[PDB]
Design a protein around this ligand. Structure first.
Ligand SMILES: [K+]
Ligand SMILES: [K+]
Ligand SMILES: [Mg+2]
Ligand code: NA
Length: 135
RNA sequence: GUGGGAUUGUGAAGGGAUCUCGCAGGUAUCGUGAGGGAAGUAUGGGGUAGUACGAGAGGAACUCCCAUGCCGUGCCUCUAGUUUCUGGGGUU
């Protein structure tokens, strides 16, 4: 529940700024709009891009009105872009999904719909507890 | 000396003279390295450690280890993209 760039192997970037992904927890939000990604060091013209396990800054576009019109923190748990594990397997999900967390990584809400990537679960133990299945 | 050419424009075939040029290098490898260019640069995590310090609240760092951002030089085993192999099938 901290900086995750140095604790994770390279994962192919999936979600640049502006991507809208599903919200997999039961907070009340339906989707999340990616504003930025933590740990992004700048490069000219290059959009900040999120992948599995990344914390992102996001806003809710659809869902409970109490959750909208504000900047929140979320963690990516599923992505449609395929990445390659060190064991040589190339794997991808059917959808993109995120989960709303506090800046400390603690999961707001109490349940997760759909599976959770192992890369995301290893970096966020609180998210791994509520995962129906890992990878 | 020898070999090869030539001389100034109204003819031809012969003789001299006088000039210019060639006369020892070719061909194929392996190396030297003067000079010039010049590139790697950052972050996080583990541990140190809830330790030093501090009344408390708070709260570090180096050896070492593991990743990552940007940049650079390549490569095509995998994954992805691309098809005028119009390859093989469909279909109006
Ligand atoms: K030099
Ligand atoms: K120089
Ligand atoms: Mg621009
Ligand atoms: Na292919």
């Amino acid at each position: 529940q901290a900086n995750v760039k140095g604790c994770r192997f390279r994962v192919s970037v999936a979600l640049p700024v502006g991507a809208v992904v599903n919200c997999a927890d039961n907070t009340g939000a339906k989707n999340l709009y990616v504003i930025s990604v933590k740990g992004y060091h700048g490069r000219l013209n290059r959009l900040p891009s999120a992948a599995l396990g990344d914390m992102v800054m996001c806003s809710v576009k659809k869902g409970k009105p109490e959750l909208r019109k504000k900047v929140l923190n979320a963690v990516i748990i599923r992505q449609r872009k395929s990445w390659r594990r060190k064991d040589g397997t190339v794997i991808y999900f059917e959808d993109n999904a995120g989960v709303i967390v506090n800046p400390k990584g603690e999961m707001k809400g109490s349940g997760i719909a759909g599976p959770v990537a192992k890369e995301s679960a290893d970096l966020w133990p609180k998210i791994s507890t509520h995962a129906p299945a890992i990878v």
